[PDB]
Amino acid sequence: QKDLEGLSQRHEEKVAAYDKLEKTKTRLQQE
Amino acid sequence: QKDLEGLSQRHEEKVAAYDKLEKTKTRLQQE
Amino acid sequence: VGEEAIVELVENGKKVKVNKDDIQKMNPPKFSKVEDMAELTCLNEASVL
Protein backbone atom coordinates (compact mmCIF):
# COMPACT_ATOMS: atom_id res chain seq x y z
CA GLN A 1 0.00 0.00 0.00
CA LYS A 2 1.29 3.43 -1.04
CA ASP A 3 -0.26 5.37 1.86
CA LEU A 4 2.58 4.49 4.26
CA GLU A 5 4.66 7.38 2.88
CA GLY A 6 1.95 9.95 3.63
CA LEU A 7 1.33 8.39 7.04
CA SER A 8 5.06 8.63 7.79
CA GLN A 9 5.05 12.28 6.68
CA ARG A 10 2.11 12.99 9.00
CA HIS A 11 3.90 11.21 11.86
CA GLU A 12 7.07 13.25 11.27
CA GLU A 13 5.06 16.48 11.27
CA LYS A 14 3.17 15.50 14.43
CA VAL A 15 6.37 14.54 16.27
CA ALA A 16 8.00 17.83 15.22
CA ALA A 17 4.96 19.57 16.69
CA TYR A 18 5.30 17.45 19.84
CA ASP A 19 8.98 18.40 20.13
CA LYS A 20 8.27 22.12 19.89
CA LEU A 21 5.36 21.69 22.33
CA GLU A 22 7.66 20.00 24.87
CA LYS A 23 10.10 22.88 24.42
CA THR A 24 7.18 25.26 25.05
CA LYS A 25 6.23 23.32 28.19
CA THR A 26 9.74 23.56 29.64
CA ARG A 27 10.04 27.24 28.67
CA LEU A 28 6.69 28.09 30.27
CA GLN A 29 7.62 26.17 33.42
CA GLN A 30 10.88 28.11 33.75
CA GLU A 31 9.14 31.44 33.10
CA GLN B 1 -0.42 -4.15 6.19
CA LYS B 2 1.81 -4.85 9.19
CA ASP B 3 4.32 -2.22 8.05
CA LEU B 4 1.55 0.37 7.83
CA GLU B 5 -0.26 -0.98 10.90
CA GLY B 6 2.66 -0.50 13.29
CA LEU B 7 3.43 3.00 12.06
CA SER B 8 -0.27 3.92 12.29
CA GLN B 9 -0.37 2.69 15.88
CA ARG B 10 2.75 4.72 16.71
CA HIS B 11 1.13 7.74 15.04
CA GLU B 12 -2.10 7.40 17.03
CA GLU B 13 -0.07 6.97 20.23
CA LYS B 14 1.94 10.11 19.47
CA VAL B 15 -1.32 11.95 18.72
CA ALA B 16 -2.69 10.90 22.12
CA ALA B 17 0.55 12.01 23.80
CA TYR B 18 0.38 15.38 22.02
CA ASP B 19 -3.27 15.84 23.03
CA LYS B 20 -2.25 15.11 26.63
CA LEU B 21 0.68 17.56 26.55
CA GLU B 22 -1.56 20.27 25.09
CA LYS B 23 -3.59 20.22 28.31
CA THR B 24 -0.41 20.81 30.32
CA LYS B 25 0.73 23.66 28.07
CA THR B 26 -2.74 25.25 28.21
CA ARG B 27 -2.82 25.09 32.01
CA LEU B 28 0.73 26.46 32.29
CA GLN B 29 -0.13 29.37 29.98
CA GLN B 30 -3.33 30.28 31.83
CA GLU B 31 -1.53 30.11 35.18
CA VAL C 1 5.50 11.79 40.07
CA GLY C 2 5.34 14.00 36.96
CA GLU C 3 1.90 13.36 35.48
CA GLU C 4 0.04 12.70 38.75
CA ALA C 5 -0.26 13.93 42.34
CA ILE C 6 -1.93 12.66 45.51
CA VAL C 7 -4.38 14.89 47.39
CA GLU C 8 -6.42 14.56 50.59
CA LEU C 9 -10.03 15.67 50.30
CA VAL C 10 -11.12 18.21 52.91
CA GLU C 11 -14.58 16.64 53.32
CA ASN C 12 -13.22 13.08 53.73
CA GLY C 13 -9.48 13.03 54.46
CA LYS C 14 -9.48 10.40 51.69
CA LYS C 15 -6.25 10.15 49.72
CA VAL C 16 -6.81 10.10 45.95
CA LYS C 17 -4.63 10.15 42.83
CA VAL C 18 -5.38 13.12 40.56
CA ASN C 19 -3.77 14.23 37.30
CA LYS C 20 -1.63 17.35 37.57
CA ASP C 21 -3.73 19.09 34.88
CA ASP C 22 -7.06 18.42 36.64
CA ILE C 23 -5.89 20.22 39.80
CA GLN C 24 -6.90 23.90 39.83
CA LYS C 25 -5.46 26.61 42.07
CA MET C 26 -7.58 28.08 44.85
CA ASN C 27 -8.12 31.73 45.80
CA PRO C 28 -7.30 33.05 49.29
CA PRO C 29 -10.40 33.40 51.51
CA LYS C 30 -9.72 37.13 51.08
CA PHE C 31 -11.65 36.86 47.78
CA SER C 32 -14.73 35.22 49.30
CA LYS C 33 -17.90 36.31 47.45
CA VAL C 34 -16.12 39.03 45.46
CA GLU C 35 -18.59 41.28 43.66
CA ASP C 36 -16.53 41.31 40.44
CA MET C 37 -14.90 38.02 39.40
CA ALA C 38 -12.34 39.92 37.31
CA GLU C 39 -10.72 40.66 40.70
CA LEU C 40 -10.07 36.97 41.47
CA THR C 41 -6.38 36.11 41.69
CA CYS C 42 -6.88 32.59 40.32
CA LEU C 43 -9.42 32.59 37.48
CA ASN C 44 -10.59 29.09 36.56
CA GLU C 45 -13.80 27.05 36.43
CA ALA C 46 -13.50 25.98 40.07
CA SER C 47 -12.94 29.54 41.34
CA VAL C 48 -15.76 31.07 39.28
CA LEU C 49 -18.08 28.23 40.32
List of chain A residues whose C-beta atoms are within 8 Å of the C-beta of residue B22:
21
In three-state secondary structure terms, C15 is strand
Identify the bridge partners of residue C7 per DSSP, sorted by sequence position. C16
Report CB contact under 8 Å: A14, B15.
Answer: yes
Note the Cα C4 to chain centre separation in Å.
15
Task: Work out whether the CA dihedral C37, C42, C46, C47 comes out positive or negative.
Answer: negative
Task: Work out whether the CA dihedral B30, B31, C5, C10 comes out positive or negative.
Answer: negative
Question: Which of B27, B28, B29 is the best mutation test for C, with the most CBs of C within 10 A?
Answer: B27
Residues C22 and C7 sit within 8 Å (Cβ to Cβ): no
- Dihedral of CA atoms C5, C9, C15, C18 in degrees, nearest 10, equals -30
Q: Experimental method for this entry?
A: cryo-EM
C-alpha distance from B25 to closest chain C C-alpha (Å): 9
